[PDB]
Structure formats: C-alpha cells, structure tokens
C-alpha cells in the first residue's frame, strides 16, 4: 500500500495525545476564498500524505476545532483550519471555502516557499467541520465524490437528507446537544446515507461542544477520526478494526455503523 504511513496502531498509540509524526504549523498568508487559515504538517511521514480541512461553528472561529490540527497531523496528515470569511456564513457558503481552503493546499503543496512544499497527495482529500461546519462538510462530500473522508461533529443542516454522499462519513454526536439535537439533526442525517461506509459515534451527556478543543475525551474521539481518516484517507487497513469497531467505551452513549468491515 503506497498510502501506509507510520507505525502499525495500537488502541494506546491513537489514544495518545500526539502521533508519532513532529509537527508544524504555519499561517496562511494570503487565504483564497475563506478567512483565515492554518496549516498544520508532519516533517518527517514518510511520504506524501492526504490533507483535510476543518470548518468551525456559526459565530466560531478556529480555536473552537484546532486541537484536529496536531492530532491528525502527527498521525501523518496535512490539515488546515479554517476561518470563514464571515462568522456568519450558512453550511453551503461554509463549504465552498472549505473546498476552496483545500484548493489552496493543492496550490501551496507546488508552491517552493511553502514549508508544505512536496508534501501532499493533492488526490487524496478529507472534510471535517462543527455543527454548520459539519453540514458544510456534508454539502463538500456530496458535491465532491472524490473526497476520500469526511468526519463532522455534532452537525447541523437545513436539510437532513445526505443520500446521494458516497463519501465515507463518520458522524460524530453530542448526546445532549440542544444547539443540534441528535434526533432532529445528527441521527437523521446519519440514517440518510444509504450508498456509503458510515459510522454514528455519540458521545454519553455531550453538550453542542463535546467534540472541540479542550473537551474531557480527546482519547476516544482522537482515536476515532485518525482511525477513520486513516482506514479512508490512506485505504489502510492496519485501521479497519479501530475505524470500524464499536469502542467499547463507557463515555458512547449510542454507536451505529454499516458498510465498515
């Protein structure tokens, strides 16, 4: 597998708070078509690795879902952090920045002053985002079948009927989120998709931020998106048993997952 990256996981090594990846980050000087930017890389993968991009919340900003940036970039990812270029943009304008945020690591990855010049597979692409983030991630992998992962947390839509994504989508939810109830936005919008690997993780008396930067299970919750995005991202299987399995964790209140072997 070209992909295979890093050493052969284990349940304490995706729990750990870094990967075994040194990592680096960088700001955006000139965003184009989103806010703001930070890029966050591994020195020393190994290879060329995928790179995904993460929408925040309506009103928030990058440090609401910054602590994805070094997680997933130790594990041998590049990933970019977004700021809208309003707080209040709606999922479908928070997407097309989100495309277009990875767009511009695409550009950065042939640019020779970037420090993350030759380092990403510009082929191999992933959506994460919170709440409106995470609908906007959900619009990105329906529009963009290409997309080899998405990952949204605790997601809100206007709609939630994401049948047509054939992106596999780990949804991550907030038990007792009222922003975004799970039975009016996370659970339907899982039940929606029928045409792809997906799995529902919902995380035991979580409020709407349960999934943000400082939360209380960042084990769990690491392990989980660097597991998934690992298994799809890179196709390595090395992580179908993380991606797949239920955690078996007393802090998941209720697990769902189909087409994950």
Not at 91 to 113: F, H, I
Not at 150 to 174: G, H, M, R
Not at 189 to 203: C, F, P, T, V
């Amino acid at each position: 597998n070209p992909y295979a990256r890093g050493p052969n996981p284990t349940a304490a090594s995706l729990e750990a708070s870094a990967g075994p990846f040194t990592v680096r980050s960088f700001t955006v000087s000139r965003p184009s078509g989103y806010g703001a930017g930070t890029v966050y890389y591994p020195t020393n993968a190994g290879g060329t690795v995928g790179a995904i991009a993460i929408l925040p919340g309506y009103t928030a900003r990058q440090s609401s879902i910054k602590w994805w940036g070094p997680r997933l970039a130790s594990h041998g990812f590049v990933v970019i952090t977004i700021d809208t270029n309003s707080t209040l943009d709606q999922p479908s304008s928070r997407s097309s920045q989100q495309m277009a945020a990875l767009r511009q690591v695409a550009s950065l990855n042939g640019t020779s002053s970037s420090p993350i010049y030759g380092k990403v597979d510009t082929a191999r692409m992933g959506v994460m985002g919170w709440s409106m983030g995470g609908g906007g991630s959900l619009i990105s992998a329906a529009n963009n079948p290409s997309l080899k992962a998405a990952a949204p947390q605790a997601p809100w839509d206007s709609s939630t009927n994401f049948s047509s994504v054939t992106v596999p989508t780990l949804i991550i939810a907030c038990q007792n989120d009222s922003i975004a109830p799970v039975n009016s936005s996370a659970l339907p919008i899982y039940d929606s998709m029928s045409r792809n690997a997906k799995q529902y993780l919902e995380i035991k008396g979580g409020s709407h931020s349960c999934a943000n930067s400082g939360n209380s299970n960042q084990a769990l919750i690491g392990k989980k998106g660097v597991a998934w995005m690992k298994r799809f991202m890179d196709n390595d299987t090395r992580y179908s048993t993380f991606a797949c399995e239920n955690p078996n964790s007393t802090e998941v209140s209720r697990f769902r997952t189909a087409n994950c072997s």
